[PDB]
Design a protein around this nucleic acid. Structure first.
Length: 193
DNA sequence: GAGCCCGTAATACAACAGATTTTTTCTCTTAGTTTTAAATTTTTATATTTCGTCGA
């Protein structure tokens, strides 16, 4: 699919199920992957919270509070083939670009994130049933800070510039400790783009 | 060629592809039922076993 845009104007998301319940939360995987920077957010949820009517859009917007996208790529799921979802996205100026009747490879990068997520979920899933909903933000923070392979830079520092706290600045420069005056961010952030 | 060390660095290969209940015999395990044979008495002559005691 088209390569990249201005910091996740193209985006992907998908669902996987089979997760064990903790508070009647047996979906808990609404993974949204910031395709350009591969920031790859995923927020806990459930099947019965919404069906794209009341609360699904609300945490979709609290994710989208950090920037509206311009293109979705998703599956033929009933939570996104509804008339309510397509029309609201059209009024938002954001395309749908659904899948092709059990062809999840259109959502490949989100599903590849899930494949990376599942291993880390098993790593952090010792307390499988009792209390583990605190681990998804932990898995997010670990996975974003870890450098990938296809780009050589961690997806956290690709968009935000700097790395998270406890600086372990590499031997390139001090440029990854970019937390200072913001009027010159545009030039080098476009260079990183 | 010929190989070796070591230090980087490419490199095909595979996982994400809704998850769960059933379906049909089998095989330990563990608790409830059923039929039946057996623990203490008389007893009667027979015999052998094994104690138990006594004797010069």
């Amino acid at each position: 699919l088209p390569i990249a845009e201005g910091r996740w104007l193209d985006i992907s998301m998908d669902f996987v199920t089979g997760l064990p319940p903790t508070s009647n939360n047996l979906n808990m995987i609404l993974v949204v992957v910031d395709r350009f920077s591969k920031r790859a957010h995923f927020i806990a949820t459930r099947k019965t919270l919404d069906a794209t009517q009341l609360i699904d859009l609300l945490f979709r917007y609290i994710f989208s509070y950090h920037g509206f996208p311009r293109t979705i790529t998703s599956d033929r799921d009933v939570r996104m083939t509804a008339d309510k979802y397509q029309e609201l996205t059209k009024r938002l100026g954001i395309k749908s670009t659904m899948s092709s009747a059990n062809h999840p490879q259109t959502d490949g990068q989100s599903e590849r994130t899930i494949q990376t997520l599942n291993r880390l979920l098993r790593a952090y899933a010792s307390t499988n049933i009792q209390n583990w909903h605190v681990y998804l933000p932990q898995i997010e923070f670990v996975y974003n800070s870890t450098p990938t392979r296809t780009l050589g830079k961690s997806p956290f520092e690709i968009d935000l510039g700097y790395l998270p706290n406890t600086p372990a600045i590499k031997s390139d420069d001090e440029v990854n400790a970019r937390s200072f005056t913001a009027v010159e961010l545009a030039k080098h952030l476009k260079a990183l783009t």
